[PDB]
Design an enzyme around this catalytic site. Structure first.
Site, PDB file in Angstrom:
ATOM      1  N   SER A 167     -10.914  -3.453   9.101  1.00 11.75           N
ATOM      2  CA  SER A 167     -10.854  -4.888   9.365  1.00 11.75           C
ATOM      3  C   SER A 167     -12.105  -5.327  10.117  1.00 11.75           C
ATOM      4  CB  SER A 167      -9.583  -5.231  10.139  1.00 11.75           C
ATOM      5  OG  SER A 167      -9.472  -6.614  10.332  1.00 11.75           O
ATOM      6  N   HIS A 181      -3.560  -5.592   4.296  1.00 12.45           N
ATOM      7  CA  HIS A 181      -4.757  -5.513   5.129  1.00 12.45           C
ATOM      8  C   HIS A 181      -4.695  -4.268   6.012  1.00 12.45           C
ATOM      9  CE1 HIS A 181      -8.294  -6.628   7.248  1.00 12.45           C
ATOM     10  NE2 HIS A 181      -7.688  -7.029   8.348  1.00 12.45           N
ATOM     11  N   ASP A 187      -4.951  -7.341  -0.009  1.00 17.63           N
ATOM     12  CA  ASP A 187      -5.433  -7.813   1.279  1.00 17.63           C
ATOM     13  C   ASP A 187      -5.705  -9.314   1.190  1.00 17.63           C
ATOM     14  OD1 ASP A 187      -7.019  -8.416   3.572  1.00 17.63           O
ATOM     15  OD2 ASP A 187      -7.760  -6.373   3.657  1.00 17.63           O
TER      16      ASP A 187
END
Ligand SMILES: [Ca+2]
Ligand SMILES: [Cl-]
Ligand SMILES: [Cl-]
Length: 557
Positions: free
Chosen positions: A179, A482, A446
């Site tokens: 991330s 994600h 995601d």
């Protein structure tokens, strides 16, 4: 005097730090800790923690770059840093998380490990007038620390302590982040090529200043399908799709796409063929063979034309009046929903929609931290405002005027947010030519950062640097949200193949993975290979479809 000892540890609190403004607050010896149900055993080690460049920002707030470092008494010679998350601002235990839902930490494998908070502190840099914990954006130097400088400073400090504590420098250095931590990893490959020999960058926000652009775009795209208004008259974007509606959409996606890889198993391995074939306005509901889009009024078995129009527009990505794409498009995938037992997957819809069962907006991109971060951290000059105004600001976003602000400088903000936060360079030659290796991964479902946008960066990298697969490879994960979650094989040990690539020259022709929630498929376990772009996982024709040995990495059928 003696190296790697309790005395050597306490002495770090005549140690010469690379930055003169380094202040050690803790230098403490730690006994070995046994393994737990959720964490591998931690060896005996020295914990050093402190801060670099204590100061007062132009907003009157205090700022410093916090670090925490752990150096095991029995050391394998490797240095390890973990990446951040969100807007950073917190300091982890710094045992060297390797992501992938793994039990083991890098400290448990006898790395020396370090972590940073990125130059601000969510407990202190929390400004009620500047949208809470994103308030560090009001300080130009804090922005630079968040973008690149904090990780640079902490890397140098950590390596200096290692060399002093052990009497020798680290043989190799490794960085793993997902991330925001994935953006950091890509940044290090581009901006600081010799800091780390091996980099894992998962779901990397390498164009993070554009997220708010997509956020305003998906917000405005979904508004025509919302039902009701929140306390300040903004459409309830979360009411645009029920969980049942989204599950219906993913079932339709599976209907069109699941078998495009050769195996009906609930996973869309052939993501390219899916994008070319699926259109929710032309696709069928496989359960009843009728069109997914309603002909009459809304039933549980169809999606209203407004719903279909809204989601298509959101997935297409934002443009300006001239029609120029401002970010990228998004991939249809089954992990947009998912059902395990009686629990619907929330790991996709929390980003653009939010929880259905709420009278207020709570999507990350409508009123949550992402919209807040764009306003204060990435727009230049920053746009602080009360929390209750954020959602309206996203609805009034002007895609001809507002997107310029991520490229702008103003006043004491002498770099644009793309300048300090963006990591878009394909010049990894220095990194490659000193032996660097990089593993990228990204889940296909995601909704924070588009897996297709990572793929487009990898395409540009391969074109700028022929033969790039010898040092950098991309592993897309069908069904994964994600960094983790969703109906896919979202658990994997990335550190072991990374070390093998860096030190033995062994490129990962595949990476073993397993599903953290195999209930999405109605099985007790599913293991599958992750495959280097542009290959996909292919079933061999026989054997258990949940066993990785019955699959191989190859081209789509
Ligand atoms: Ca399949
Ligand atoms: Cl994790
Ligand atoms: Cl078998």
């Amino acid at each position: 005097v003696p190296l790697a000892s309790r005395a050597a540890c306490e002495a770090l609190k005549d140690m010469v730090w690379p930055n003169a403004a380094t202040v050690v607050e803790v230098a403490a010896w730690r006994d070995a800790a046994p393994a737990t149900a959720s964490a591998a055993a931690l060896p005996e080690h020295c914990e050093v923690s402190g801060a670099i460049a204590k100061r007062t920002g132009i907003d009157g707030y205090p700022y410093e770059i916090k670090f925490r470092l752990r150096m095991p008494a029995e050391w394998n010679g490797r240095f390890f840093m973990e990446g951040g998350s969100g807007t950073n601002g917190s300091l982890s235990a710094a045992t060297g998380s390797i992501g992938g839902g793994q039990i083991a930490s890098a400290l448990s494998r006898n790395f020396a490990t370090i972590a940073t908070d990125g130059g601000h502190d969510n407990a202190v840099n929390d400004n009620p007038d500047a949208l809470g914990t994103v308030a560090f954006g009001l300080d130009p130097q804090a922005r630079l620390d968040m973008g690149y400088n904090s990780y640079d400073q902490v890397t140098q400090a950590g390596k200096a302590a290692v060399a002093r504590f052990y009497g020798r420098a680290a043989d190799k250095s490794y960085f793993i982040g997902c991330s925001e931590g994935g953006r950091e990893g890509m940044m290090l490959s581009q901006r600081f090529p010799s800091h780390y020999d091996g980099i894992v960058a998962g779901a990397p926000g390498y164009q993070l200043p554009k997220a708010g652009i997509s956020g305003a775009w998906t917000t405005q795209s979904l508004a025509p399908a919302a039902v009701g208004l929140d306390a300040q008259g903004v459409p309830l974007i979360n009411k645009s799709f029920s969980d049942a509606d989204l599950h219906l959409l993913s079932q339709a996606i599976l209907g069109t796409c699941d078998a495009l890889d050769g195996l009906a198993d609930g996973i869309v391995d052939n993501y390219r063929a899916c994008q070319a074939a699926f259109d929710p306005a032309t696709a069928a509901n496989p359960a009843n063979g009728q069109a997914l889009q309603c002909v009459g009024a809304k039933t549980a078995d169809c999606l209203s034309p407004v719903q279909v129009t809204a989601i298509k527009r959101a997935m297409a990505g934002p443009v300006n009046s001239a029609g120029t794409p401002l970010y990228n498009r998004w991939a249809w995938d089954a992990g947009m929903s998912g059902l395990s037992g009686t629990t619907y997957n929330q790991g996709w819809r929390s980003w653009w929609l939010g929880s259905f069962n709420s009278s207020a907006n709570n999507a990350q991109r409508v009123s949550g931290f992402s919209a807040r971060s764009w306003l204060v951290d990435f727009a230049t000059p920053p746009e602080p405002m009360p929390m209750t105004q954020v959602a309206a600001r996203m609805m009034k976003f002007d895609f001809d005027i507002d997107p310029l602000k991520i490229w702008a400088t103003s006043g004491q903000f002498t770099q644009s947010s793309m300048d300090w936060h963006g990591a878009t360079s394909t010049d990894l030659a220095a990194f490659r030519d000193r032996g660097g290796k990089m593993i990228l991964y990204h889940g296909m479902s995601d909704a924070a950062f588009s897996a297709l946008d990572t793929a487009d960066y990898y395409e540009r990298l391969g074109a700028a640097m022929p033969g790039a697969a010898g040092f950098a490879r991309l592993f897309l994960v069908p069904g994964m949200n994600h960094c983790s979650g969703g109906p896919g094989t979202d658990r994997f040990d990335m550190l072991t193949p990374l070390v093998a690539w860096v030190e033995r020259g062994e490129a990962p022709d595949q990476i073993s993975a397993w599903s953290g929630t195999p209930g999405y498929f109605g099985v007790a376990a599913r293991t599958r290979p992750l495959c280097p772009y542009p290959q996909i996982a292919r079933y061999k024709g026989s054997g258990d479809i949940n066993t990785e040995a019955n699959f191989a990495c190859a081209a789509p059928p």
